Amino acid sequence: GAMNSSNYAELFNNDIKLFVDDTNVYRVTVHKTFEGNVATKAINGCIFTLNPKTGHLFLKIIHTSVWAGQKRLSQLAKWKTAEEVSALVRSLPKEEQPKQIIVTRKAMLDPLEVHMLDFPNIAIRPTELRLPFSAAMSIDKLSDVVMKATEPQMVLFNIYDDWLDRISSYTAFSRLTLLLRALKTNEESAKMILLSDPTITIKSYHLWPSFTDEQWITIESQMRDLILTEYGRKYNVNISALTQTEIKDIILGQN
Amino acid sequence: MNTVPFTSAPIEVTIGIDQYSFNVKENQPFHGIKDIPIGHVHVIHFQHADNSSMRYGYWFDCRMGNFYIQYDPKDGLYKMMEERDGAKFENIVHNFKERQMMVSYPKIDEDDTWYNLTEFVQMDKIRKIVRKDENQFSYVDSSMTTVQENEHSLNYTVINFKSREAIRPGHEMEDFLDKSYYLNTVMLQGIFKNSSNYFGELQFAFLNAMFFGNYGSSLQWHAMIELICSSATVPKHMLDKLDEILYYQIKTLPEQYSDILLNERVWNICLYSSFQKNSLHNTEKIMENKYPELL
């Protein structure tokens, strides 16, 4: 699984690398046109590009103007993502450019390889982990900045808040993935956990609440419980029977 | 019809000529091959008893000269040579009169198969790939690799669908999804100059894969097929010709080698997914009849 994957271990070496998730690029609301058929209406989307080492999230907001006059949007979205990711990389100083880009969906490989031909030293690879990055719009400050956009724009976030002052990148990425996996599993339950104590505030400049080290342990335990009970119902298994490597496989989404 | 005499045959050998083959045993008298349709290109090839030794041979054109075979005890190979003096060659051809023991190239009154397999293969196409030397004929063997394999070389035009050459900057999606720019501007207009040269290399790739077992040649053949089919815009005369070219290749392919000479991915794309799938009418028909396991 993930815990015996040399690939997974590599995320936390000293190479610069970026995850790209394109799941939220093309988003719609569902309607009906005069012919009675299904009608879709694009709403703003985003590219989730993350440095798992620093927590820096380059959130490219995909304003609905970029679909105007275009067709086959579900195919185009992947090519647009690739276009933007490559533009990002071009914008960066050389020693800040990633040695590797990991796409969450294999359908991104051809479009990104083609767009990155000017960077032959940047390796594009898929992952066998089903990472929960699509749940990114369950984070209110991300959802809000995307929906309020009136034009294409890039917004930088640190998705680890101030955690790296106290824990390692591995621990912060594991925390991030746990939170997103919980929000993906059931957003209401996951929010009830995060927001149960309103005296622990989400700072204006943060995405997550200001838990103490002590409090994060409890929160992480509750998130784990939520995720594993859903898996447990899905397969009719007691949580307590799951091994630690199994739990990580569940959380990271090992194929 | 022409003759390729042998001035000696001192060593056992299995000999191929175009699609035919025969054995010459230890101490068997043998003076060559006659009744060869003049045509415009042929291959003669050789295999000795050690299965581990290479198959080697020569592509040649009877129209260009008087060619013959002679064993060379120095390199230990049958070699092709040219006789520029017509009278000396005539003497070689008629040496020994009724005592001549020769193979007759089968009559092909309605087996235009060899013509169809080599329609666009002329010696200049071959020399592009197998570097020209002092001879009017071109040596090839089963140990040769392509420059692409390398990354005695087969210098095919490199086709790479994910390369700057295939993709104009700013046309990424356009050029990856529709290969027309790459086929028409880069390959046909830029490199091959015309479709006959393109088809010639495609046919030679097939023949080398079939005769000398070179996997890189099979890769090149498939890539040149895929390039055409994955282009929305192809000159109509190419489109109409491609189906016939492939039809005879599939027809002639040794069925024992079909597993390693035929790429499932490329054929399913070309026949069922590509822009030009409807232009492969007979090729689809022969594939379905002869190799249904590939579809």
Side-chain angles (χ1 to χ4, degrees):
Chain A
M3 314 306 297
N4 293 291
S5 165
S6 64
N7 272 0
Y8 182 61
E10 192 176 8
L11 293 169
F12 312 105
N13 73 13
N14 290 333
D15 281 349
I16 298 180
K17 61 209 83 74
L18 298 176
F19 272 116
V20 164
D21 178 270
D22 66 309
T23 59
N24 288 317
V25 163
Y26 176 45
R27 296 201 301 153
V28 297
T29 51
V30 187
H31 311 270
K32 271 186 183 180
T33 332
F34 57 3
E35 297 206 305
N37 274 327
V38 181
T40 60
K41 196 182 302 195
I43 65 183
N44 296 342
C46 60
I47 307 170
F48 184 98
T49 300
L50 171 73
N51 180 334
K53 187 114 157 166
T54 58
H56 293 148
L57 165 66
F58 299 88
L59 192 72
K60 174 58 188 215
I61 298 172
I62 302 294
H63 184 255
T64 65
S65 63
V66 316
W67 311 129
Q70 297 279 15
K71 289 140 155 285
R72 290 163 300 282
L73 300 187
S74 285
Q75 167 181 64
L76 182 64
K78 302 183 178 56
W79 290 91
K80 174 67 176 172
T81 303
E83 177 186 346
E84 291 299 336
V85 169
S86 53
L88 174 56
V89 172
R90 297 169 195 285
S91 77
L92 299 175
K94 174 167 57 64
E95 60 287 311
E96 204 181 312
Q97 300 177 331
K99 317 296 188 313
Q100 172 176 221
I101 302 174
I102 300 98
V103 299
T104 56
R105 314 205 289 174
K106 288 178 201 269
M108 278 303 305
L109 292 169
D110 286 349
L112 188 63
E113 286 176 42
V114 168
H115 272 275
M116 299 292 285
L117 291 168
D118 290 338
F119 306 92
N121 294 316
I122 307 181
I124 311 314
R125 81 158 168 91
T127 178
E128 297 299 328
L129 311 168
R130 300 168 185 160
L131 289 162
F133 297 148
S134 71
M137 298 292 96
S138 278
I139 300 167
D140 290 356
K141 296 185 191 208
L142 305 192
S143 180
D144 283 352
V145 75
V146 165
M147 292 305 295
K148 289 175 176 163
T150 71
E151 73 196 286
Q153 57 193 264
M154 162 78 105
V155 184
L156 282 3
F157 288 96
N158 184 344
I159 209 174
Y160 296 162
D161 291 347
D162 60 356
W163 309 339
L164 297 176
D165 304 340
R166 315 182 295 285
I167 68 182
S168 80
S169 296
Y170 174 90
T171 304
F173 185 78
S174 298
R175 182 178 293 163
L176 171 69
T177 60
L178 186 76
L179 289 161
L180 293 169
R181 173 69 62 201
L183 289 157
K184 197 166 185 170
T185 301
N186 186 286
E187 187 190 279
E188 295 75 39
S189 297
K191 286 171 178 173
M192 291 180 66
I193 293 163
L194 284 166
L195 269 32
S196 78
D197 195 337
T199 75
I200 305 162
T201 70
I202 303 181
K203 296 303 168 292
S204 76
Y205 45 74
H206 278 165
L207 298 181
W208 312 103
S210 303
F211 296 118
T212 62
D213 296 347
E214 200 167 280
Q215 289 168 342
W216 268 123
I217 293 318
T218 294
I219 293 287
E220 289 172 344
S221 177
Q222 299 174 303
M223 294 297 182
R224 190 168 310 111
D225 170 271
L226 182 175
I227 294 158
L228 301 179
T229 68
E230 158 72 30
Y231 173 97
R233 290 169 184 158
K234 194 186 327 179
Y235 291 85
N236 297 83
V237 206
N238 192 342
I239 285 188
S240 57
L242 298 181
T243 63
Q244 174 82 6
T245 73
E246 276 180 296
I247 295 175
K248 304 312 300 321
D249 279 344
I250 292 166
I251 298 164
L252 296 162
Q254 182 74 60
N255 266 282
Chain B
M1 272 166 300
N2 278 14
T3 295
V4 178
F6 277 49
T7 55
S8 66
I11 299 291
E12 63 83 32
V13 71
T14 293
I15 300 170
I17 179 86
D18 301 343
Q19 67 266 69
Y20 303 104
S21 65
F22 60 91
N23 298 323
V24 178
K25 300 188 227 270
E26 255 116 24
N27 315 318
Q28 174 184 345
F30 179 70
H31 306 101
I33 306 164
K34 70 186 202 147
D35 296 338
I36 305 180
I38 302 232
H40 62 263
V41 83
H42 303 277
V43 66
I44 181 165
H45 60 79
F46 302 90
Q47 172 73 51
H48 301 283
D50 188 345
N51 299 346
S52 171
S53 70
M54 67 185 174
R55 177 131 105 189
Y56 61 96
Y58 307 83
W59 289 93
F60 63 103
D61 176 2
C62 297
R63 299 173 306 169
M64 303 182 64
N66 300 316
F67 304 105
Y68 65 105
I69 298 300
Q70 182 168 304
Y71 192 66
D72 167 31
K74 291 174 287 196
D75 291 340
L77 293 173
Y78 282 100
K79 298 198 174 165
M80 177 163 289
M81 312 186 67
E82 184 182 353
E83 181 47 70
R84 277 247 108 103
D85 186 316
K88 180 171 175 187
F89 186 75
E90 283 301 291
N91 272 9
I92 297 294
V93 168
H94 306 297
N95 259 347
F96 319 136
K97 301 192 163 61
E98 73 260 35
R99 298 192 177 241
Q100 271 179 3
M101 295 289 183
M102 294 215 179
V103 151
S104 293
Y105 193 106
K107 167 51 66 180
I108 50 174
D109 237 278
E110 199 15 82
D111 187 87
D112 223 14
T113 294
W114 186 250
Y115 171 81
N116 286 114
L117 285 175
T118 60
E119 177 177 353
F120 297 102
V121 181
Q122 277 76 47
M123 289 303 305
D124 67 319
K125 285 81 177 176
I126 296 185
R127 290 160 186 153
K128 158 153 139 49
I129 297 169
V130 181
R131 285 1 206 83
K132 229 297 183 162
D133 50 28
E134 346 89 66
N135 309 305
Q136 288 195 108
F137 49 89
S138 297
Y139 172 89
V140 175
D141 70 42
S142 56
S143 85
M144 284 179 179
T145 55
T146 77
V147 175
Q148 214 164 2
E149 267 171 329
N150 293 350
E151 283 213 337
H152 291 280
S153 244
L154 304 171
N155 191 19
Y156 292 113
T157 292
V158 171
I159 292 173
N160 178 3
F161 298 128
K162 296 168 176 177
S163 68
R164 178 48 70 212
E165 290 72 25
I167 308 290
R168 295 168 292 179
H171 294 269
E172 285 73 13
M173 185 176 179
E174 178 187 350
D175 282 347
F176 189 71
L177 294 189
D178 173 7
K179 313 284 183 197
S180 289
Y181 160 74
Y182 194 28
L183 172 64
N184 290 293
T185 290
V186 182
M187 290 292 160
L188 288 178
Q189 293 163 41
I191 302 175
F192 290 96
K193 302 306 172 190
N194 61 63
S195 54
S196 298
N197 298 330
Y198 187 97
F199 280 148
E201 177 154 326
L202 180 163
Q203 281 177 323
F204 186 73
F206 174 76
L207 291 160
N208 196 61
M210 180 175 68
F211 282 122
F212 298 90
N214 172 235
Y215 190 61
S217 294
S218 183
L219 257 37
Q220 180 75 18
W221 177 56
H222 287 95
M224 298 186 82
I225 295 169
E226 169 163 18
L227 176 57
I228 294 169
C229 292
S230 301
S231 301
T233 312
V234 175
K236 197 83 228 292
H237 73 272
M238 285 200 49
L239 269 186
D240 281 296
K241 189 74 220 176
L242 180 66
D243 183 37
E244 303 168 28
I245 285 169
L246 303 181
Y247 180 88
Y248 275 89
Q249 297 171 331
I250 304 305
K251 181 164 118 72
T252 311
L253 211 159
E255 5 194 351
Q256 307 80 10
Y257 306 174
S258 66
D259 50 334
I260 44 87
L261 293 180
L262 285 184
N263 181 284
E264 177 165 339
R265 176 195 72 82
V266 179
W267 289 103
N268 281 275
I269 286 169
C270 294
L271 295 176
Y272 307 120
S273 302
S274 73
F275 288 105
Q276 310 300 340
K277 56 173 162 263
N278 296 324
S279 279
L280 299 180
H281 176 272
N282 296 276
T283 299
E284 132 104 49
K285 180 130 251 77
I286 189 168
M287 280 289 265
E288 190 157 36
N289 202 32
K290 187 159 211 181
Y291 299 115
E293 69 276 14
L294 279 315
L295 303 324

